[PDB]
């Protein structure tokens, strides 16, 4: 609670900003996060606190779970970093909002989409339906409407990590830890029975899937696909 | 991002000296000074205090002397839940307490002369006291009431009884033992060293010399007024 701004490599950061931080577990895949607090310590160094958002490969989940192209999940981790950890800006958008249009902004980096909060303790994904309560209180934006947008969802990036002797009644596995001051080195996958009803299109094995979701190999043959965001309009 | 914190109907502000619950000893609180306060997304209120050790919590020569209520400054800037605050206190700078008294009224009176190196176990006399404070009050001037002819009783180490039975003047500096990591050491250690002839700060009981403003154990003067709580004597 000292500073309203910090500058790193000729770039400003403020509380509320979406930014990337150095990951000690993978120097090429940065931690995606949002700054909640800035300050200076007695020694002159500048510090910040960001709520960590995990990439799919960093979570523990069923092997059949599908993700959006650039999906991230919010955690209960709020961590302190030397501002010299910042490696650039990005932008995380709430899926419900992104369903209806694009952010009216000039993104200064990669765009990530979030639909779920991740319960690190019980390994449980929960749809966030009140984005506002997730943000720092001192920031609680326009949107460019798009006609009928759909989302390609893709299989787990760590689906190849299912144990050879897995069963649908296995205990939920633990993530693998690397550096203590970093996101999990790698999550883990496990097996469960199919389901009939699937309101949010979470799993590839479910009988039902929402109409705005295109599951792998469904392969439509009409519309315009945005390779980068894996979105499609028609 | 907070201005003040109210615990048990007591207001705490940055730059304040206070007592924090010590998980190694519920009746011997951590002495600290509040460097900053803030609220986390969940609403809990936090603070960052610079820890100050008591003698029993440090590693030092078995013949080291200490003032009554002496504390040392450390490099430990720790975060606490403000619920940890158990009371106010005040830490005064030896050189100041040497000339007189603080001109104010909210708890136990400690004095600090030395800062403590946790890596090499070195005590270094503090000459620039303002540099140890939070930036916000670093240049704030305080009132001191002059007291002529004040001397200090020094006291033998409270953990002298922990000297190994086979100690020598050339044994390596020992390590403290840690209890809770969310707390200062459960207890420090003592070791032996050859004594010195010149000792300006009156640090050791075996030194030939001792400055005039210090009175070592057994060296009792048969005149003057003694304040029991602080071990100060005048006239
Ligand atoms: Cl899952
Ligand atoms: Cl760091
Ligand atoms: Cl595609
Ligand atoms: Cl010593
Ligand atoms: Cl705590």
**Domain-wise residue ranges, chain B:** 1-235
Closest residue to A36, CB basis, from B36, B41, B77: B41
**Alpha-carbon dihedral of residues B13, B19, B20, B21, nearest 10 degrees?**
-150
| Ligand nearest the Cα atom of residue A206 | 1
Integer-rounded Cα Rg, in Å, for chain B is: 19
How far apart CA A63 and CA B143 sit, in angstroms, is: 69
What are φ and ψ of residue A56, in 5° steps?
Answer: -55, -50
Nearest CA in chain B to A38: B1
Beta partners for residue A224, in sequence order: A233
Nearest CA in chain B to A135: B41
How far does residue A116's CA lie from ligand 1's centre (Å)? Answer: 11
Nearest to A20 by CA among A80, A91, A88, A83: A88
Give contacts of B35 with chain A, Cβ < 8 Å. 42
Give the β-pairing of A149-154 and A46-54: unpaired
Give contacts of A39 with chain B, Cβ < 8 Å. 36
How far apart CA B75 and CA B51 sit, in angstroms, is: 7
Architecture of domain B1-235: Roll (2.30)
How far apart CA A77 and CA B41 sit, in angstroms, is: 11
- Work out the burial of residue A213: count CB atoms within 10 Å of its CB; fewer than 13 is exposed, 13-18 middle, 19 or more buried: middle
- Work out the burial of residue A115: count CB atoms within 10 Å of its CB; fewer than 13 is exposed, 13-18 middle, 19 or more buried: buried
- The answer to whether B1 contacts A41, with C-beta atoms less than 8 Å apart, is no
Nearest to A50 by CA among A38, A35, A37, A39: A35
How far apart CA B184 and CA B54 sit, in angstroms, is: 9
DSSP state of A30: P
Fold annotation for A1-234: SH3 type barrels. (2.30.30)
Closest residue to B41, CB basis, from A1, A2, A78: A78
How far apart CA B201 and CA B190 sit, in angstroms, is: 19
- The answer to whether A42 contacts B1, with C-beta atoms less than 8 Å apart, is no
How far apart CA A192 and CA B93 sit, in angstroms, is: 66
In degrees, rounded to 5, the angle at the alpha carbon of residue B67 between the alpha carbons of residues B66 and B68 is 120
CA–CA distance from B171 to each of B55, B163, B204 (Å)?
20, 11, 18
Three-state DSSP string of chain B: CCCCEEECCEEECCCCEEEECCCCCCCCCEEEEEEEEEECCCCCEEEEEEEEECHHHCCEECCEEEECCECEEEEEEEEEEHHHEEEECEEEEHHHHHHEEECCCCCCEEEECEEEECCCCEEEECCCHHHHCCHHHCCCCCCEEECCCEEEEEEECCCHHHCCCCCCCCCCCCCCECCCCCCCCCECCEECCCCCCCCCCCCECCCCCCCCCEECCCCCCCCCEEECCCCEEEC
Dihedral over Cα of B12, A39, A41, A76: its sign: positive
Q: Is A131 helix (H, G, I), strand (E, B) or coil?
A: helix
Closest residue to B38, CB basis, from A37, A42, A137: A37
Q: Give me the residues near ligand 5 (ion), CB cutoff below 5 Å.
A: B 81
CA distance B11 to chain A (A): 19
CB atoms within 10 A of CB B59: 23
Instruction: Check if the beta carbon of residue B144 is closer than 8 Å to that of residue B103.
Output: yes
How far apart CA A65 and CA A56 sit, in angstroms, is: 10
- Establish, for the pair of chains A and B, how many residue pairs have beta carbons separated by less than 8 Å: 21
Q: Which two tokens stand for residue A98?
A: 């992104």
In degrees, rounded to 5, the angle at the alpha carbon of residue B5 between the alpha carbons of residues B4 and B10 is 110
CA–CA distance from B152 to each of A29, B81, B212 (Å)?
60, 36, 9
- Approach to solving: X-ray
- The answer to whether B50 contacts A42, with C-beta atoms less than 8 Å apart, is yes
Dihedral over Cα of B104, B106, B108, B114: its sign: negative
Give contacts of A3 with chain B, Cβ < 8 Å. none
Quick one: residue A223, left, alpha or beta (phi over 0 = left, psi -120 to 50 = alpha)?
left
Give contacts of B40 with chain A, Cβ < 8 Å. 78
Nearest CA in chain B to A134: B41
Residues of chain B with a CB closer than 8 angstroms to some CB in chain A: 1-2, 35-38, 40-41, 50, 77, 134-135
DSSP state of A15: T
Q: Which two tokens stand for residue A202?
A: 């979470």
CA distance A134 to chain B (A): 9
């Amino acid at each position: 609670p000292h500073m309203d701004e910090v500058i790193v490599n000729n770039i400003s950061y403020h509380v509320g900003d979406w930014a990337l931080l150095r990951n000690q577990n993978d120097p090429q895949k940065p931690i995606v996060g949002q700054i909640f607090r800035l300050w200076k310590t007695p020694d002159g160094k500048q510090w910040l606190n960001a709520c960590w958002y995990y990439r799919p490969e960093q979570t523990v989940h069923r092997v059949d779970r599908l993700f959006y192209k650039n999906e991230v999940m919010k955690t209960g981790q709020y961590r302190d970093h030397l501002v010299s950890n910042l490696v650039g800006k990005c932008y995380v958008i709430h899926f419900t909002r992104y369903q209806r249009g694009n952010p009216d902004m000039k993104l200064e980096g990669p765009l990530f989409v979030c639909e779920f909060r991740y319960n690190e303790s019980d390994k449980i994904f929960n749809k966030i339906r009140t984005w506002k309560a997730c943000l720092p209180e001192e920031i609680r934006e326009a949107t460019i409407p798009v006609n009928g947008r759909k989302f390609f969802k893709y299989p787990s990036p760590i689906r190849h990590l299912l144990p050879a002797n897995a069963t649908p009644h296995d205990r939920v596995p633990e993530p693998t830890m690397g550096s203590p001051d970093a996101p999990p080195l790698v999550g883990a996958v496990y097996m469960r029975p199919k389901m009939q009803r699937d309101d949010l299109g979470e799993y590839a094995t479910s009988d039902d899937c929402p109409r705005y979701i295109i599951r792998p190999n469904d392969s439509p043959e009409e519309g315009q696909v945005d390779i980068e965001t894996g979105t499609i309009t028609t």
